[PDB]
Amino acid sequence: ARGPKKHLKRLAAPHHWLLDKLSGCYAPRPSAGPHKLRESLPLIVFLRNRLKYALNGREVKAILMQRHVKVDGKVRTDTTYPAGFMDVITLDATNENFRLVYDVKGRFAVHRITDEEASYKLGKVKKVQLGKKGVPYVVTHDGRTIRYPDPNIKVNDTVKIDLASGKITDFIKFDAGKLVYVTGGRNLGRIGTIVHKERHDGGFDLVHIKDSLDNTFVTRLNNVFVIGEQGKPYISLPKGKGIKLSIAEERDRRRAQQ
Amino acid sequence: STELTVQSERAFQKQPHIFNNPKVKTSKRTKRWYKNAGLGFKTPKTAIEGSYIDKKCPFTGLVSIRGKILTGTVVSTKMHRTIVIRRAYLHYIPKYNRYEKRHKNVPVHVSPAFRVQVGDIVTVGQCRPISKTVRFNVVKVSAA
Amino acid sequence: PRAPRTYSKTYSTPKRPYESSRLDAELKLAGEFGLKNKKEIYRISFQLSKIRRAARDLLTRDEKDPKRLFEGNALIRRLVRVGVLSEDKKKLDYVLALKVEDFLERRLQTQVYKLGLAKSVHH
Amino acid sequence: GISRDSRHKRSATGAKRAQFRKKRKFELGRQPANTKIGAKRIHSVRTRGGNKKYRALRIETGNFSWASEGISKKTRIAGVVYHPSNNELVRTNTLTKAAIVQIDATPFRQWFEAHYGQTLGKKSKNAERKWAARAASAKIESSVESQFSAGRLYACISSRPGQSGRCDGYILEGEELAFYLRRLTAK
RNA sequence: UAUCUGGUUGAUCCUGCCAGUAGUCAUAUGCUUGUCUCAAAGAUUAAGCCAUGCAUGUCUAAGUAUAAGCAAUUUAUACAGUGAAACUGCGAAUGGCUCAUUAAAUCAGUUAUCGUUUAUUUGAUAGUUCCUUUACUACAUGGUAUAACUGUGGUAAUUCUAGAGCUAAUACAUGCUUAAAAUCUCGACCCUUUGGAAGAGAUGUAUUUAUUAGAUAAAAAAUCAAUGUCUUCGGACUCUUUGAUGAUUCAUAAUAACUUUUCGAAUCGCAUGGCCUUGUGCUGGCGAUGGUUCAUUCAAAUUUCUGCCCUAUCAACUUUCGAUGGUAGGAUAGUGGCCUACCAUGGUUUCAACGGGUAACGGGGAAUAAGGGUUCGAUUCCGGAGAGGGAGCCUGAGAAACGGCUACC
RNA sequence: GCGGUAAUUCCAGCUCCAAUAGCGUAUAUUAAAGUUGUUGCAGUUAAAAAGCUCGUAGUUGAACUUUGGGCCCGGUUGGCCGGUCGGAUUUCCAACGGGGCCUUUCCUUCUGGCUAACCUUGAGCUUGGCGAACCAGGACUUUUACUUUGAAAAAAUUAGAGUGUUCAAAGCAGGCGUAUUGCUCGAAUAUAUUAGCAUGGAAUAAUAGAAUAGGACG
RNA sequence: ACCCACUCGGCACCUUACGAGAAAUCAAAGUCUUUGGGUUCUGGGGGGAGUAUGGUCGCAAGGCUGAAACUUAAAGGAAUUG
RNA sequence: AGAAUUUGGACAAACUUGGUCAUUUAGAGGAACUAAAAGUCGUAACAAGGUUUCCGUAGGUGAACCUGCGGAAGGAUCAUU
RNA sequence: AUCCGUAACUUCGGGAUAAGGAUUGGCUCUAAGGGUCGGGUACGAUCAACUUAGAACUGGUACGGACAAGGGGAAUCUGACU
Numbered sequence A: 001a002r003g004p005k006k007h008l009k010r011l012a013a014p015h016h017w018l019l020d021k022l023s024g025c026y027a028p029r030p031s032a033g034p035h036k037l038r039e040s041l042p043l044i045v046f047l048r049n050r051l052k053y054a055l056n057g058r059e060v061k062a063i064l065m066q067r068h069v070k071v072d073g074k075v076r077t078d079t080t081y082p083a084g085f086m087d088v089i090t091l092d093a094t095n096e097n098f099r100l101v102y103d104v105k106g107r108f109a110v111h112r113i114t115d116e117e118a119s120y121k122l123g124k125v126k127k128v129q130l131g132k133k134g135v136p137y138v139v140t141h142d143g144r145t146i147r148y149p150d151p152n153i154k155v156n157d158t159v160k161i162d163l164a165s166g167k168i169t170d171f172i173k174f175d176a177g178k179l180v181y182v183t184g185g186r187n188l189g190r191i192g193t194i195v196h197k198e199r200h201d202g203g204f205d206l207v208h209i210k211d212s213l214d215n216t217f218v219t220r221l222n223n224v225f226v227i228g229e230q231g232k233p234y235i236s237l238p239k240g241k242g243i244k245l246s247i248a249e250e251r252d253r254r255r256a257q258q
Numbered sequence B: 001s002t003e004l005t006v007q008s009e010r011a012f013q014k015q016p017h018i019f020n021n022p023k024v025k026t027s028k029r030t031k032r033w034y035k036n037a038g039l040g041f042k043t044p045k046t047a048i049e050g051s052y053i054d055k056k057c058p059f060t061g062l063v064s065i066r067g068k069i070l071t072g073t074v075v076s077t078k079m080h081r082t083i084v085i086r087r088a089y090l091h092y093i094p095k096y097n098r099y100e101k102r103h104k105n106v107p108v109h110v111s112p113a114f115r116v117q118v119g120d121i122v123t124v125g126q127c128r129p130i131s132k133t134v135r136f137n138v139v140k141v142s143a144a
Numbered sequence C: 001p002r003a004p005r006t007y008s009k010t011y012s013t014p015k016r017p018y019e020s021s022r023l024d025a026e027l028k029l030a031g032e033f034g035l036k037n038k039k040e041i042y043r044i045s046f047q048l049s050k051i052r053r054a055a056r057d058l059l060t061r062d063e064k065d066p067k068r069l070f071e072g073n074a075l076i077r078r079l080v081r082v083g084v085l086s087e088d089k090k091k092l093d094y095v096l097a098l099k100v101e102d103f104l105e106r107r108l109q110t111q112v113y114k115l116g117l118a119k120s121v122h123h
Numbered sequence D: 001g002i003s004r005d006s007r008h009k010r011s012a013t014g015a016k017r018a019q020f021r022k023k024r025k026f027e028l029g030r031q032p033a034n035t036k037i038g039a040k041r042i043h044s045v046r047t048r049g050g051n052k053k054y055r056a057l058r059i060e061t062g063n064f065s066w067a068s069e070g071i072s073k074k075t076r077i078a079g080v081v082y083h084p085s086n087n088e089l090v091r092t093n094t095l096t097k098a099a100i101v102q103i104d105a106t107p108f109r110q111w112f113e114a115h116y117g118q119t120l121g122k123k124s125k126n127a128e129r130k131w132a133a134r135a136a137s138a139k140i141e142s143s144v145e146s147q148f149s150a151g152r153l154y155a156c157i158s159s160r161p162g163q164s165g166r167c168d169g170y171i172l173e174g175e176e177l178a179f180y181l182r183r184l185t186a187k
Numbered sequence E: 001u002a003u004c005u006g007g008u009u010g011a012u013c014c015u016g017c018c019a020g021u022a023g024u025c026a027u028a029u030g031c032u033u034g035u036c037u038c039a040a041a042g043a044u045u046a047a048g049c050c051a052u053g054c055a056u057g058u059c060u061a062a063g064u065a066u067a068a069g070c071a072a073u074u075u076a077u078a079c080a081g082u083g084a085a086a087c088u089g090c091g092a093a094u095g096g097c098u099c100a101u102u103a104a105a106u107c108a109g110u111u112a113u114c115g116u117u118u119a120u121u122u123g124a125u126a127g128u129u130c131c132u133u134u135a136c137u138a139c140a141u142g143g144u145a146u147a148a149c150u151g152u153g154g155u156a157a158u159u160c161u162a163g164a165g166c167u168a169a170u171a172c173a174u175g176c177u178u179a180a181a182a183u184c185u186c187g188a189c190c191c192u193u194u195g196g197a198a199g200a201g202a203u204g205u206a207u208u209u210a211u212u213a214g215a216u217a218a219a220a221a222a223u224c225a226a227u228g229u230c231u232u233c234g235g236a237c238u239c240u241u242u243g244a245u246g247a248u249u250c251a252u253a254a255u256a257a258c259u260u261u262u263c264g265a266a267u268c269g270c271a272u273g274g275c276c277u278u279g280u281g282c283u284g285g286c287g288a289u290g291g292u293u294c295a296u297u298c299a300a301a302u303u304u305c306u307g308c309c310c311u312a313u314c315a316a317c318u319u320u321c322g323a324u325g326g327u328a329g330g331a332u333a334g335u336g337g338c339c340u341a342c343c344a345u346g347g348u349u350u351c352a353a354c355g356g357g358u359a360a361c362g363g364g365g366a367a368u369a370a371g372g373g374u375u376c377g378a379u380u381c382c383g384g385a386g387a388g389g390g391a392g393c394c395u396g397a398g399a400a401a402c403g404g405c406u407a408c409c
Numbered sequence F: 001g002c003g004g005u006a007a008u009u010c011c012a013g014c015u016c017c018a019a020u021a022g023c024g025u026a027u028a029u030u031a032a033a034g035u036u037g038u039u040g041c042a043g044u045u046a047a048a049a050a051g052c053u054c055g056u057a058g059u060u061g062a063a064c065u066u067u068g069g070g071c072c073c074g075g076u077u078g079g080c081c082g083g084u085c086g087g088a089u090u091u092c093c094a095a096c097g098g099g100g101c102c103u104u105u106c107c108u109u110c111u112g113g114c115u116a117a118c119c120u121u122g123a124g125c126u127u128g129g130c131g132a133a134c135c136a137g138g139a140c141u142u143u144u145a146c147u148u149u150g151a152a153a154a155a156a157u158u159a160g161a162g163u164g165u166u167c168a169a170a171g172c173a174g175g176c177g178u179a180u181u182g183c184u185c186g187a188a189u190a191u192a193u194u195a196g197c198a199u200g201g202a203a204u205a206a207u208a209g210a211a212u213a214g215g216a217c218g
Numbered sequence G: 001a002c003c004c005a006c007u008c009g010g011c012a013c014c015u016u017a018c019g020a021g022a023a024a025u026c027a028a029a030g031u032c033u034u035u036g037g038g039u040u041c042u043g044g045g046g047g048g049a050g051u052a053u054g055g056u057c058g059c060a061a062g063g064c065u066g067a068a069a070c071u072u073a074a075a076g077g078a079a080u081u082g
Numbered sequence H: 001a002g003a004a005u006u007u008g009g010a011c012a013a014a015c016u017u018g019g020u021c022a023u024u025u026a027g028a029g030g031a032a033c034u035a036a037a038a039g040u041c042g043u044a045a046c047a048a049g050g051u052u053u054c055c056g057u058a059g060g061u062g063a064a065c066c067u068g069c070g071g072a073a074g075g076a077u078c079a080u081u
Numbered sequence I: 001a002u003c004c005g006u007a008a009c010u011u012c013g014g015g016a017u018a019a020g021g022a023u024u025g026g027c028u029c030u031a032a033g034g035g036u037c038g039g040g041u042a043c044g045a046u047c048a049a050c051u052u053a054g055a056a057c058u059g060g061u062a063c064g065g066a067c068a069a070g071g072g073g074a075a076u077c078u079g080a081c082u
């Protein structure tokens, strides 16, 4: 009321942060940033709850304020910087590099990567427009504006960014047979090789996807993110590789290794 | 429709920024702007060749169709460029596990491209607010 | 403001307060197993009622239904673990047919009594 | 103050709506300017988002476009001769969009004489070359040429002076001019 | 855990209620009360009244410090540690409380903005500004207050303040310095007919208006109006530039001008390095702050569809002066009777309008439930509304704000 | 209902019973209540069929239009075998459900490419058939209800999986090593009406079509 | 005009209960806990009460519509022996 | 640059006066209902209740009630080929 | 005089100018309301009315400016009324 909200109560935070319903009345409200609030890891949670490198918010502020951690090559000495899908988090101390990437259950995974893979990320182009003075630009899912792209880069395509300069090195087009990552909804985290898309001039393009096990599903085009061709992707995938084992098979494997 | 003596109003009725230079002179009675409203609705010949202006028409006017596409039957044609359609539907009551007839009345703007009579089935499209009660525009007629 | 703690009650009072048969059975159980309250028997009956409701909801379904398989095998495992249900009886009908005494025999009190060490349930 | 909301006046059925939600500023309205002529007096309005809005009072000049020739010139506004919404704005010489006004025409005479050469009403080789190349394009019309006798061109205000601070417009041509002349000279 | 029992008769079977029976994150009260964990709590009647005290302030390396403050630097004679005060900048519009109003209103889910604003984040993004622009200029950088402070005071009193004297800025407030090239206009003069010219000026971004481009399913010929790029002037002719949406007068660009004229860094810390024609010479790093536009995010506003309790001992309602619609205008951040002028006569209704009542904020949900259902939902989350009642408004991105002003009661 | 000089009912004593750190009373509400009745009441006499007929908002509404037969393909269950040491294969008799084709059966296509599976056959893996199986864009295109699947429906709550809060209510924890340096499983899943979105089916129930042919093909 | 046989449609009647029903009784009051052919109306313990009040019709008499307070554990149906 | 003051306009609190709606509430007297009470007057109904009961309507009478017209059996008649 | 608004009761015709309120000048304008002629077998010209509504401006807030011109309401007795 009367202005923007600055607090976030627990039980109103997204469930994929895995915050205790106890342990406080409030949750961290992600600052304005390149990622939506309901799609944001932020760093306090990433460092305290997932990695256990800190036990409080004081310790996280202490870590961030001596500039050990950087997001996408930039330091981000903020406690509630919204880090999201495909963001690269580099801890020069520990020589660690993480890529924010969903597990198949719908949560963010602690996916360690190499320094050569942390030198780039992927971006889903949202719009291609003409800017002032006739300069074309593309906008990605992380709010990155990139001028003078290849004219063949159309919307719903994926773009390889170099993360030191904001330049484009390559791009994948949206087409059948292309490997996708699902970013949003019930099928969040799956990886399944587009077969065909359904248009519906007027609203909400759909797209059909089929996992390695030939399990088919359907999603909206806003929840889809191409990451390469069938076989080779353009990134390192986490454990599970977006297969979504049924609960029965999950317990069978947990009993196989115990 | 009735074609209603196009320049009947006190202001001159023209399409904005559609300028017919008097210096050069050709055929094409007057530079007439029209558009394809989209969604497979055909732009009628009456709209392409007519002389009416209709600021609020979705073919020659400055409104767009976006959102819902509804369908109804005309129960009133007594307003000017405005009609009322009856949308009949069935509402489910779970306790009794059976339905009851319900209706809404929806006022919609109709271009002179169409001549609608009471009883005609129309399909309308959501537009921006056209008046206190009107948010829909006729975009196809489905009867005679 | 804070997330509320969840709580539930674990017993259900019977509808008829004064039924001599039920009273006799309850007191026989209390004397055989060393109990101070009918609340303990009510609690065991409550747990058993929940288990039976679950088993009925599953048995109404088809076999090879994934929910039935998963939850029924889980229930059976969870009861075989405490020994309330023998490993001879793993078909989800004996679950319905179990008893109150099958639960009540696995309490640490009577289990101590069985494993020597007390020579009485009150001891 | 003035409210721009709909939770006042009745629903379409005819029902009176109860008082919900004391007046809000995101539905505010403000008083008109009623822009008059002469002695520029522009007051600024601070609107939502900052976003200055220039409320013209007492405006004298205007940029008026001749579209057949593709130019625009700054002229004085003499007075209002027709408004399609209210005759009292004409009586008061109040400026609004869609107001028909008279303007000076001297910059247009000058431009015509320097661009085409001939005249309106009734030296160097470079200039004669320009004027000969720009021939068969100086026989504009009868009504505008007749207006140039009096140096009072009929124009329509196309701008919103109470919003931007400008009385800009376009000179009347063709069927618009015929329409407004029929509306005026009839009596 | 799909259960019923007592009471009408002299007795029987019924209908039928009364009574019993069990439960209640439903209250109260009575009696009693030893332990562990967990934990609601002035909602119901009075959205009745409030003593007192607290609840919103805030700084770094990095806007302003001669504290006549504390220190000691001793690298410092302009400052250069710490730092009250005060100026400046942000925030105070979040949060928390309550449920009075409110019955297609709120709200739920589902839509839209091709109908608009958006501080802050985040990412990109101004070589064009000396105005007769050849002394008109400070650009190694221009000007004026004023606070805090000193001191004189007023009042019984308040987070009251006056007069007098200083002094700063990322305050106010002006104001310069950076390419070249191309294209357009005027155009001196040479003069030709094929006709050419030196020179001057304009050309960023933002505002306002008018105009133009923003295209395209396919293939060849006839000659001309004038020759068009080059000519072996027969005429070889290609090259020609055009993005997105389901859809636009979209994005964007180009002409003409318009503006009382926006922005385009007179800011700050740390490091102090490279090149010499050794001058306080020319270059030069990591950052902070600020700024135009676009996009992004946090939102906001409006909005589509369907859905809400009782009542007909409420059946007709709306429309004077807005009801339904049209044209135009005004206003608005924007759509729209939101308001005005003119015009028309519409709009809702037994499929329950309108009116009345609610011991009615709405939902998520809670209790009890064989199944179906009944009742509840002030209350830990979401939305809305309010700050004793009304109304109005300043500041700001954002309030019709109330631990902010103005008035009336 | 007890109590009117032998009170099993009052005031007490004794004993006994029920729940038990809880028990009672009041009010409200739920079940009981098939005493609200959609599931699921009753209406001759117990309360209740309007005096009788007609009739407008509604509810309900006869039958009929592709059936039958065949041929194939590959799935799920089974079944000897267990050719593995109480786990599984594949050739198998059958059942259960899908798809395609032919039987008079266009079960919308226009322009094009992959030409696809291709008379394409080079000596037993080669030089060259038919547009969707991959896309583009178009001519168009009877309308609903219904049902399946899917997306969507905040979290908490609910049901529910796993797990030491010492049990439990709960919580989302935790567990395992040479514990010297560390390793690791998780934080599922389901429900969530009605309205809207897409999707397959196309019986059931409505709706329309060519009849003074301004009808279809071409 | 009568007789015989048959048939459609009526007013009814006799016998039985397969069935129904609390029974009296019922060819519908059956095909209803094995509960759904379609549809309208009415009732929810007895009184107060078809009262009061308000509307509406009516010349009026009155009709139609129609409560509440309060009170009460029984009123009532069909049968049984006295 | 700009204070006091000030013209007109829209927003419009609040007050007064009327009107209207609703909810509570007083009231001489009047007219009912309910109960209590071993009250007074009768005895209308239950049997053919001593004139068979009842319905509608109308009139009348201390009161139950009586009478007239028409109807019903819930009758005291399922019955005279 | 124009506009608003009008109760009980009622023989439904009235009550009723019920009650009770606002406005009214001068000036300058605006709008609307008409007749007669004209067209091979939509309009133009011309002529003349006082009626209504509205807006500005104006004044020592005055204006049916003199004249002219209802006081009203709640009830009773009584005669129906003229």
Ligand SMILES: [Mg+2]
Residues within 6 Å of the ligand: A001
């Ligand atoms: Mg708040």
Ligand SMILES: [Mg+2]
Residues within 6 Å of the ligand: A006, A028, A029, A030, A031, A080
């Ligand atoms: Mg935050």
Ligand SMILES: [Mg+2]
Residues within 6 Å of the ligand: E008
């Ligand atoms: Mg009795």
Ligand SMILES: [Mg+2]
Residues within 6 Å of the ligand: none
């Ligand atoms: Mg007895």
Ligand SMILES: [Mg+2]
Residues within 6 Å of the ligand: none
């Ligand atoms: Mg009871």
Ligand SMILES: [Mg+2]
Residues within 6 Å of the ligand: none
């Ligand atoms: Mg920025």
Ligand SMILES: [Mg+2]
Residues within 6 Å of the ligand: none
């Ligand atoms: Mg408008």
Ligand SMILES: [Mg+2]
Residues within 6 Å of the ligand: none
């Ligand atoms: Mg309008």
Ligand SMILES: [Mg+2]
Residues within 6 Å of the ligand: E360
């Ligand atoms: Mg309330």
Ligand SMILES: [Mg+2]
Residues within 6 Å of the ligand: E378
């Ligand atoms: Mg309340």
Ligand SMILES: [Mg+2]
Residues within 6 Å of the ligand: E386
């Ligand atoms: Mg508020």
Ligand SMILES: [Mg+2]
Residues within 6 Å of the ligand: none
């Ligand atoms: Mg208070």
Ligand SMILES: [Mg+2]
Residues within 6 Å of the ligand: E402
């Ligand atoms: Mg306030």
Ligand SMILES: [Mg+2]
Residues within 6 Å of the ligand: E403
């Ligand atoms: Mg306060």
Ligand SMILES: [Mg+2]
Residues within 6 Å of the ligand: F009
């Ligand atoms: Mg007793």
Ligand SMILES: [Mg+2]
Residues within 6 Å of the ligand: none
């Ligand atoms: Mg005793």
